[PDB]
């Protein structure tokens, strides 16, 4: 009934407090032991300035929303888990109410109580030991599927969830912006999805040249190269069929209206700091869609998941991507902020993964 | 075999001429004698300019894309008309072959050959006597429709694209932005399909009044009264659904993404001179969806013909919306010139219309 | 927190009980008083053989699932309605945990309690004076919807979930099989979405006459008079677009098939007693596709409910169909039996409602 | 120009005839030097009774629809094939104009003109030494995509077709009826196209067996075994969620209905003789969705080729799946009818081959 707990107080203020372990209520709630965390844009975003957008910080916080644990209790109604499971943790709980949830978007839900974000107390964040979670929001992991995977399971969904709105179906042509975590494992579902082409394109030739390591990108692009011509060259002269836009930043967003065939899908996933920019015009002349992305929704996490799954089922020799290059740091719950400010000097770090307590 | 023409031969250049009538070649082929013709603003942006993003001027271009004229011969193969019906005139012939074409899109045609634009000869113009069209690109009129509201169906085509494009339903809430012709013809469409609230945004008064008049909107809201929570407060509170933006300007699509409710369709017709600065990030946010639309493609031209024929079966009278003050302006062919001008100038005509030599 | 109810105990053996009022216990519950209660297939299904499918009955069952009422009690946390409201009920929960609640389709839910089907205690009936809701599976009546209406609301939904599998868009050529209750209001549905043509057939001249009567169906065929060449001349040679399929019989099923136009939508809502004869072959060279129809889904009351709101905002007189005409026999509570028995016998009824205690 | 031919002339009367050769007409006509030839159950139908269905035989008809050749003559237009490239040949050719066509569905050109199929004169068969096509209905072939696959093509496009009907997608669980040439070819698809398992159904061990041993299948049932539940053991416990028909026989159907998930989506690909005993109330209760498949459309050569291409272009000793097994016989064209009588005495021959003269 103890629980130790990395908190975000106030702005650079990381602390190790503990707390009260969270006790199940619910007949479907479970009590996960979190072994391992993931750490991404959002989680310095807060460290430094405690705020994201509106999301503003007022209170001693919980920390962490990538992770993955083992089932330590269950209630009554459980049926999908036993006590002794490796599970991948869904972090925003909607309520299930809403017109939004009814709908089958729970997505949108604007009681959504994600982990990790402020704002009535806070919602737990996944930086300590025991985390409360409802039964059909954790994914059991296959035994193959590494407990550290699990942790990734989050950024993979993020990109199941934007290559499913952009339709990517075999023998499609995807461009993904931006080389970082979540546009690398896009450009990982794209290529699982049966794409005949992925080319992945930023301005870091380290970077590129992982997604093209990893086997999760077919081609490559540096966009300090050219514009829209000498990406399609670098793309065997296939045009792109969707855009996966991983970066948020206009001269991503313009480079792939100009790129993508007439009637091509382009998905928004990358946020900006404010308004962009935009090519409108050459976007209704060639009948583009744009898909906003937010998160992930009803079956994205199981089928990140299945990626593993069928990605590693016949061994990490046989395994046509290679995710686990996407860790680059590993740390005990003991050098907690010894990552954070890792990750918040940019030292190289794609990915960086936690222990529990 | 003799077929007066307007041209337009260099910038602000319109002459007169008379060259030989179009004669039959295909057995599909069908001649028409154009009675009505309509204007806008493509017209008079090629006079003014002689280009239109990339299409530029090059030769004497024969003029005019919105007109509705009598068949007056057919070929063998024609089996949809008989000389002498009244048909509305589709001036956008694709190729058929390509994969646009195939696909159900010759919208997307690359080798789209349009009325009025220019680059091989330049694609004939409907300002004349005799048009020459395969027999499935005209729509036979039905007896209660105007041959002028002929001319009228290819604004409306447009707006029945986009609503589609929107999937504009029963019971939706609907926010087209410009009260001109195109968007409000395209509010009239909302209306028509169902939709239980159309509210039309603008900076005129004067046109925001007659899309009520019309009976086309159920509420109107003039954009310089506020922002997103006065647009809907002018719309009973009623959140938007989908919006159809018809304007092309930044504070209107701003103020389109502001009000539209999360996983709302947003649809892009107007055309902006270049780049505008787009709130790319509370898009992805609230998981929205942009649809270019351009022109417009199957079945539209039908869809929109018939507006006009269950709007007007059972007499003027009774019609739902009365499109025919669209018209504002009518002139005779002698007097083109002084209709071009005229729409030129903007002196308050909504739409003018020519009438055949 | 007394009740008096109308149960089914046995077969042929229905009587009033009194049991204890519903009392609210979740913050979201609603109470409401049953005023006006429909009555179709199912309610004397149960009464003749106590079995439908396999859903069969085991104990004293509490009757009634068409029904509407008044807010009498509200909890904490209800938002969207007032102790006073009048509302259309929802008479299936389901448990909006499962994998069919969460995709948006509670519709299949396997945990669906429905009103008056039996199978742990038998879900409430609405047969009673107080019933039991969660907040948002009632919809609150416009003042100018008629408190009988709401009991229409139930088999008015069901015709909204079809036409809405079905796609049923402006200009659409839809056949509705069965002019029973059912198949009339599912073919007001279609023309209030914007059918050009809407033709029902069925056996009974009678019913035929108030499809046409009430302004719900432009066409009308009895199938006595031939096969699929007939209903299409019946149609003014249109030929349709989407089948909505009411009867569940043979003749109709095979007749929908050689009508419908190739690539056309066909719904499936007609319940059979077992398999039947199908035509799979022209199924599939036509490229029909076939939905099945199970009740009604999200935001599909709501929409009913809308659908009264504008047929009747501008005044009976002025309403574009004549929905109370549905309305044939009326009774009191303690009339209940000699309702049933009524409609038992078939005397001529298309719907009766019976009045709360 | 001279051009030997295959030709049934009446029933069981097949007879080598030459005619002359096909001429380019028109710019965009491509000749092509048949190589390779299938065979399946539409062959020895019209050989047996010169009727499928209300297709009959009236005149002398050149035979032949599945086959391959070489580019040897191309007109004026022509920008997609060189004199000297591998096809694989679509064989039926639509009008372009019609509205099916216009749609994007030439899959249903009421004006259809199919390879060896009757009825003004037959068009032309495949089992000649030249043939012609217009450009955008031949598919360059990859060079490790044998002349012979070139043929197995058609059967392929039929289940690319249908599995896109099906909307197949990653994770999916497909249970395909029938583990002939095209029921394993559509399995070889679903696997393809990312589902997560693939169960082939039929009654003969031989073709199971040869379903699992290609890689097409993960499992396999044997119809006899038992009813549904079996089915979803031998599934390893997965529920189907996508049922590919492509036999056409009552038991058949009747079993993918009872072990089709609920919302699941059922292709009709089979053809049966008439009509057939049908769930159809099952259907409605679990909301399948029945997509009639016919033949092969947009994009879908294509994506068969492709399919070939990615299988096979890490060497046939990396290939998935072993295509190549489906040919079990091959002939020269002078033995053809040793060919034709071999597959219409059933000896058990998967797929036969006939050489080009
Ligand atoms: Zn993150
Ligand atoms: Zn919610
Ligand atoms: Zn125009
Ligand atoms: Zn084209
Ligand atoms: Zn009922
Ligand atoms: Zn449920
Ligand atoms: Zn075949
Ligand atoms: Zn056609």
């Known amino acids: 009934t103890a629980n130790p707990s990395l908190v975000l107080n106030?702005?650079?203020?990381?602390?190790?407090?503990?707390?009260?372990?969270?006790?199940?209520?619910?007949?479907?709630?479970?009590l996960v032991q979190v072994?391992?965390?993931?750490?991404?844009?959002?989680?310095?975003?807060?460290?430094?300035?405690?705020?994201?957008?509106?999301?503003?910080?007022?209170?001693?916080?919980?920390?962490?929303?990538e992770s993955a644990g083992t089932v330590v209790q269950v209630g009554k109604g459980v049926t999908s888990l036993k006590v002794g499971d490796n599970v991948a943790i869904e972090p925003g709980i909607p309520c299930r109410?809403?017109?939004?949830?009814?709908?089958?978007?729970?997505?949108?839900?604007?009681?959504?109580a994600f982990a990790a974000t402020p704002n009535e107390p806070n919602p737990?964040?996944?930086?300590?030991?025991?985390?409360?979670?409802?039964?059909?929001?954790?994914?059991?992991?296959?035994?193959?599927?590494?407990?550290?995977?699990?942790?990734?399971?989050?950024?993979?969904?993020?990109?199941?969830?934007?290559?499913?709105?952009?339709?990517?179906?075999?023998?499609?042509?995807?461009?993904?912006?931006?080389?970082?975590?979540?546009?690398?494992?896009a450009a990982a579902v794209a290529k699982t999805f049966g794409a005949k082409g992925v080319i992945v394109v930023d301005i870091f030739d380290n970077k590129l040249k992982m997604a093209k390591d990893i086997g999760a990108a077919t081609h490559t692009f540096?966009?300090?190269?050219?514009?829209?011509?000498?990406?399609?060259?670098?793309?065997?002269?296939?045009?792109?069929?969707?855009?996966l836009?991983?970066?948020?930043?206009?001269?991503?967003?313009?480079?792939?209206?100009?790129?993508?065939?007439?009637?091509?899908?382009?998905?928004?996933?990358?946020?900006?700091?404010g308004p962009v920019s935009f090519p409108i015009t050459v976007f209704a002349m060639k009948e583009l869609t744009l898909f906003g992305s937010?998160?992930?929704?009803?079956?994205?996490?199981?089928?990140?998941?299945?990626?593993?799954?069928?990605?590693?089922?016949?061994?990490?020799?046989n395994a046509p991507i290679d995710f686990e290059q996407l860790i680059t740091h590993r740390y005990k719950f003991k050098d907690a902020i010894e990552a954070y400010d890792l990750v918040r000097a940019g030292k190289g770090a794609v990915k960086c993964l936690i222990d529990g307590p």
Do not use: W
Request: aromatic content about 10%.
């Open 10 to 30: 106030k702005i650079d203020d990381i602390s190790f407090e503990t707390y009260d372990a969270p006790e199940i209520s619910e007949p479907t709630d479970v």
């Open 35 to 65: 072994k391992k965390t993931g750490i991404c844009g959002s989680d310095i975003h807060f460290y430094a300035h405690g705020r994201i957008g509106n999301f503003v910080l007022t209170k001693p916080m919980v920390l962490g929303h």
């Open 97 to 112: 109410f809403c017109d939004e949830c009814k709908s089958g978007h729970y997505n949108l839900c604007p009681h959504m």
């Open 124 to 185: 737990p964040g996944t930086l300590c030991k025991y985390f409360k979670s409802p039964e059909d929001f954790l994914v059991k992991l296959p035994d193959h599927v590494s407990l550290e995977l699990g942790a990734l399971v989050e950024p993979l969904s993020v990109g199941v969830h934007a290559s499913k709105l952009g339709s990517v179906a075999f023998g499609d042509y995807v461009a993904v912006f931006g080389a970082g975590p979540v546009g690398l494992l």
């Open 222 to 243: 540096n966009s300090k190269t050219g514009g829209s011509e000498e990406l399609i060259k670098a793309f065997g002269g296939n045009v792109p069929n969707v855009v």
């Open 245 to 273: 836009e991983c970066t948020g930043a206009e001269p991503c967003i313009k480079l792939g209206v100009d790129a993508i065939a007439p009637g091509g899908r382009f998905v928004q996933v990358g946020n900006a700091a």
């Open 294 to 317: 937010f998160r992930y929704g009803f079956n994205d996490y199981k089928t990140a998941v299945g990626i593993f799954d069928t990605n590693y089922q016949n061994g990490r020799e």
